[PDB]
Amino acid sequence: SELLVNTKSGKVMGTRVPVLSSHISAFLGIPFAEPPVGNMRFRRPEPKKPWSGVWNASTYPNNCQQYVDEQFPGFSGSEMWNPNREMSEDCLYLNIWVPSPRPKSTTVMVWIYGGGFYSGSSTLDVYNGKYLAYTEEVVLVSLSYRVGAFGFLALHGSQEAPGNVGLLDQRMALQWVHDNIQFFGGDPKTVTIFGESAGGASVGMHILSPGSRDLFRRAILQSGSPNCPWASVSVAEGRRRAVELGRNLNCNLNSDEELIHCLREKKPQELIDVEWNVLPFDSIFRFSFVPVIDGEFFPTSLESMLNSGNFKKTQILLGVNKDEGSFFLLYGAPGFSKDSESKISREDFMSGVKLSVPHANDLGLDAVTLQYTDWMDDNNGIKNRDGLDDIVGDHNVICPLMHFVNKYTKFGNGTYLYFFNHRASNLVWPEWMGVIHGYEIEFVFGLPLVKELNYTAEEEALSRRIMHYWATFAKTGNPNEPHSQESKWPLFTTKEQKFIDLNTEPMKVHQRLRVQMCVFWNQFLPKLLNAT
């Protein structure tokens, strides 16, 4: 039977699903690690023990225990990101969408969801692999990993909560795809991992980490890179937050064993209730528990790894959205509202700059303000709003990703950069937010192809273009069709630094994606803060 597959872990029974008036197979909720419950909390994942009989993989698995957004109850715009399944510490499962008839050895794509390392589910609607699997004829795998304290608590030196266990979770899923995807029709020697936000940072981290390099062929990073200011902490800050977390739940703090044991007796929702209290600064776009440079997963510091060429050399395709920042200002900066044009005054502008660059002294806060203020029109509410929006995106996503793409390209074997700047016609968020963080995803998974979702004809056209780029790239290491007549997505080179825009208009190539600001955030500011 086409829905029955025999893996090295046991037999699995999938289900047939309809897609764009046709069908494909779907094996949902296949386990890849032992349930990290009880004494296993905070600990590294262990391989799932083989099973007898047939595992029923016809329904989605549970979602990792996480923080849930309730800023806008009912609002689809924010709930489409919340977990749509029972939350449980028994979360480590993966989903596979296989074409029909089953391929013999086709290209594999493994998706890693984003969410600031504190949230995310593989089961959201926007992450439905069937449209992409079907349309491009690829095996689509979607894994899951532990988030928040559960996946990133870090008491270095201890084997009870080493840290990065959330990344080990992902590696585990990748190890399984490597050892079994062949039985699903996939070709293990041609697996592309691709992510978004924290998932984009995760992809970049497997490229840097020696232990994961041999488990994939290529990579796609969307709106996120490993060296982002929010994606990692030092073991010292990791330890500082581990303790403070324990201090909020009134736990014995005399020793790591003391602390860890107390944290293991707490109900999942109790760690999550106080999780946001450990941040060192009043900030925006920063998260409590994230990866930590431990000396294991990451040999040395990220910057020295990027400078020494110490990382997997292959091809990569990455890019960013036009307005990456707006989403975080809405939720945390004074002045912004989902229901108003949110024009910002001088006072609120500067409050925002303080919240965006939390680690900067008064001199730095001034450098940022001077760099983002048009003194001929300083009290223009629309300019202060869009200026603040730019600061958050540049410092947190764009300028960091450009530093990565530039350091990488010097040792890589091919780079392709994009700039997604198209606002979907059916977006429910206000206009001032623009091309929002994470909304390019729907085009990657092809939601525009399903009529009922209400997308324009050109938006469906854009979705197919992108799906063919990602898929053609996953297969060949080049997003372009061999002998096509269409426009060629030029290659990014240290010299030219070309890139293309991604929207419903005739392709246009450009150069030096936001150089003016990227030099400020990557060269000047760092230097200034270090001298002062």
Nearer to a copy of itself by Cβ, of 457 and 531: the residue is 531
Token duo for residue 121: 């589910």
- CA 305 – CA 20 distance, rounded (Å): 45
In the region spanning residues 495 to 524, those forming contacts with a copy of itself, defined by CB under 8 A, are: 511-512, 515-516, 519-520, 523-524
Q: Does 74 bind a copy of itself (CB under 8 A)?
A: no
**Radius of gyration of the CA atoms of the chain, in A:** 23
Nearer to a copy of itself by Cβ, of 367 and 453: the residue is 367
Nearer to a copy of itself by Cβ, of 24 and 391: the residue is 391
Q: State the nearest-atom distance from the C-beta of 375 to a copy of itself, in Å.
A: 4
- CA 43 – CA 267 distance, rounded (Å): 16
In the region spanning residues 375 to 404, those forming contacts with a copy of itself, defined by CB under 8 A, are: 375-376
Choose, by CB under 8 A, the member of 253, 367, 453, 507 that binds a copy of itself: 367
Q: Is 257 part of the annotated catalytic residue set?
A: no
Q: Does 456 bind a copy of itself (CB under 8 A)?
A: no
- Check if the beta carbon of residue 105 is closer than 8 Å to that of residue 139: no
Residue with tokens 């029974």: 13
Q: State the nearest-atom distance from the C-beta of 97 to a copy of itself, in Å.
A: 43
**Alpha-helical regions (H) of 41-197:** 76-79, 130-136, 148-152, 165-180
Nearer to a copy of itself by Cβ, of 425 and 523: the residue is 523
In the region spanning residues 167 to 186, those forming contacts with a copy of itself, defined by CB under 8 A, are: none
- CA 522 – CA 355 distance, rounded (Å): 19
Q: Which of 121, 142, 197, 212 is catalytic?
A: 197
Q: Exposed e or buried b for every residue in 87-114, given b needs 16+ CB within 10 A?
A: bebbbbbbbbbbbbebbeebbbbbbbbb
Nearer to a copy of itself by Cβ, of 363 and 461: the residue is 363
Q: State the nearest-atom distance from the C-beta of 463 to a copy of itself, in Å.
A: 31
Q: Does 370 bind a copy of itself (CB under 8 A)?
A: yes
Choose, by CB under 8 A, the member of 244, 366, 458, 501 that binds a copy of itself: 366
- Check if the beta carbon of residue 194 is closer than 8 Å to that of residue 111: yes
Q: What is the dihedral of CA 296, 298, 303, 306, to 10 degrees?
A: 120
Nearer to a copy of itself by Cβ, of 243 and 519: the residue is 519
Token duo for residue 51: 């099973």
The H or E element containing residue 198 is helix 198-208
Pairing of strands 93-98, 139-142: antiparallel
Q: Is 437 part of the annotated catalytic residue set?
A: yes
Q: Which of 324, 440, 442, 460 is catalytic?
A: 324
Q: Does 374 bind a copy of itself (CB under 8 A)?
A: yes
Q: Is 156 part of the annotated catalytic residue set?
A: no
Q: Does 365 bind a copy of itself (CB under 8 A)?
A: no
Q: Is the peptide bond prior to 101 cis by the omega test (within 30 degrees of 0)?
A: yes
Q: What is the dihedral of CA 405, 407, 409, 410, to 10 degrees?
A: 170
Catalytic sites, residue numbers: 197, 324, 437
Which residues contact a copy of itself (rule: CB under 8 A)? 363, 366-367, 370, 374-376, 511-512, 515-516, 519-520, 523-524, 527-528, 531-532
